């Protein structure tokens, strides 16, 4: 077709607001102030193809998964209504994070104004997924201890909102603050260490290991750290500049770690939910 015809451009001719990673030398979309042109580019090969599709396929996966979760029989729940709500809040965070991300990546080349707006939604999306993930895991961890469940929900909410406020800053979007961005969101997820240590002190090592928490949490800690490390250090495009322009650059791999990370989190909290069903609501413990 002959409307909104465009070609890929080298990094050196890009405007300032489109230069996020100088290790991606060719294959960039040029600035196009048409939403029609931007949405059509999803089916074109460029630097954002992988970043778009990973969180587009990821968005439908969590939408379908979140739907099936609502239709599960309550015969299997110990409080289906308030239970389905905690998971719902995790699913809300997961869907918004992946929705804001693929939308940002699609309309990234539009204009400076549209790019600024969708980047702030993208960053805010990360914090919403971190806050949302804390809601189910905690409710089950502090099931018999409501006072610390309540405080930790307030702490992650104050930090998550603060992180969302930080994401409204202009200097935050710059490539100079790539590591600042990595540390802020890493610190948000790693803040979970305090509630985890409190849990281990109260319940003990055997409890934490037998329930399966120690394992699944270590995997979470790993995906969080490796994903942040790749993102911050621009691996592997740092080693091969001009060789990972389309496939396997740091951002694309990071997007994949998010999908796998949210799914691993779901698996763990789904298990805690099943463990609660076996022992029941009552706690003579």
């Amino acid at each position: 077709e002959f409307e909104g015809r465009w070609r890929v451009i080298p990094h050196d001719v890009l405007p300032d607001w489109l230069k996020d990673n100088d290790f991606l030398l060719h294959g960039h979309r040029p600035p196009m102030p048409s939403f029609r042109a931007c949405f059509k580019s999803i089916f074109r090969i460029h630097t954002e193809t992988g970043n778009i599709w990973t969180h587009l396929l990821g968005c439908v996966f969590f939408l379908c998964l979140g739907i099936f979760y609502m239709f599960r029989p309550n015969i299997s729940f110990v409080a289906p209504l308030q239970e389905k709500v905690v998971f719902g809040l995790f699913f809300l965070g997961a869907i918004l994070c992946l929705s804001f991300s693929w939308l940002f990546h699609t309309v990234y080349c539009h204009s400076e104004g549209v790019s600024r707006l969708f980047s702030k939604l993208d960053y805010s999306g990360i914090a919403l997924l971190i806050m949302g993930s804390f809601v189910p895991w905690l409710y089950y961890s502090f099931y018999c201890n409501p006072q610390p469940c309540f405080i930790y929900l307030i702490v992650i909410c104050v930090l998550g909102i603060a992180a969302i406020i930080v994401s409204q800053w202009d200097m935050f979007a710059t490539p100079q603050y790539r590591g600042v961005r990595a540390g802020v969101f890493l610190g948000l997820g790693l803040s979970g260490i305090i509630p985890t240590l409190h849990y281990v002190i109260s319940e003990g090592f055997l409890k934490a290991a037998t329930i399966g928490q120690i394992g699944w949490l270590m995997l979470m800690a790993s995906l969080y750290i490796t994903g942040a490390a790749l993102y911050a250090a621009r691996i592997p495009e740092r080693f091969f500049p001009g060789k990972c322009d389309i496939w396997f650059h740091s951002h694309q791999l990071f997007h994949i770690f998010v999908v796998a990370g949210a799914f691993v989190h779901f698996h763990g909290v789904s298990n805690l939910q099943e463990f609660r069903f076996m022992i029941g609501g009552g706690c003579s413990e």
Partner: antibody, heavy 118, light 107 residues
């Protein structure tokens, strides 16, 4: 700097042919599309067509399909435009203009004046 | 083919004044619009692209606006070197088209 250098003015007879040269330097030739623009004396600009140095393909405006032929010399980063069966209507300043992803033109050649005279 | 209607066809203004050149596209061109300035005998130079993006080296006096089919080029505080011809161009649909031009004279 990016520079587009065209050949000098041409004075031709009716029914003759001309080949206009566009020498591009300062960037990777294959990376951007080259366009051709016509400007009749005292008149506005007209779009002849676009050429892709990487693919080798070209898109011509229906008005100039029989008039213009676009060629390329990849080795010397040069674009060419041949004008056939010239008439008095073809007396114009012909430009080469370079695209940057989308067809807005940052770089232009100095223009080649074609005068048809018997 | 998309037709580009540029208005006024010609105008004369004094130094320090503001001028507005309008452009009307026959169909939606989705902000894929460029503005050019041409000096007598010389080649055209890009002033504004993508409807409102100011090209490198171009004074802030020049501003492009509009959307859909109605676009505008504004020149605040006219300078003596601003004389010449002005052209709009759409690059949304092929064949690409230019406006009829606007001749600007300074007093």
């Amino acid at each position: 700097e990016v520079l587009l250098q065209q050949s000098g003015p041409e004075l031709v007879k009716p029914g003759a042919s001309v080949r206009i040269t566009c020498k591009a330097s300062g960037y990777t030739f294959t990376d951007f599309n080259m366009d051709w623009v016509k400007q009749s004396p005292g008149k506005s600009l007209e779009w002849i067509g676009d050429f892709n140095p990487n693919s080798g393909g070209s898109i011509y405006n229906q008005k100039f399909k029989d008039k213009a032929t676009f060629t390329v010399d990849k080795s010397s980063s040069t674009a060419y435009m041949e004008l056939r069966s010239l008439t008095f209507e073809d007396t114009a300043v012909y430009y080469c203009a370079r695209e940057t992803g989308t067809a807005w033109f940052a770089y232009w050649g100095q223009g080649t004046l074609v005068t048809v005279s018997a | 083919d998309i037709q580009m209607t540029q208005s006024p066809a010609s105008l004369s203004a004094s130094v320090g004044e503001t001028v507005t050149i309008t452009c009307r596209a026959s169909g939606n061109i989705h902000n894929f619009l460029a503005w050019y300035q041409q000096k007598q005998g010389k080649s055209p130079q890009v002033l504004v692209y993508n409807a409102k993006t100011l090209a490198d080296g171009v004074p802030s006096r020049f501003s492009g606006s509009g959307s859909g089919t109605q676009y505008s080029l504004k020149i605040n505080s006219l300078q003596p070197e601003d004389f010449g011809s002005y052209y709009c161009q759409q690059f949304w649909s092929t064949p690409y088209t230019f406006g009829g031009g606007t001749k600007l004279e300074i007093n």
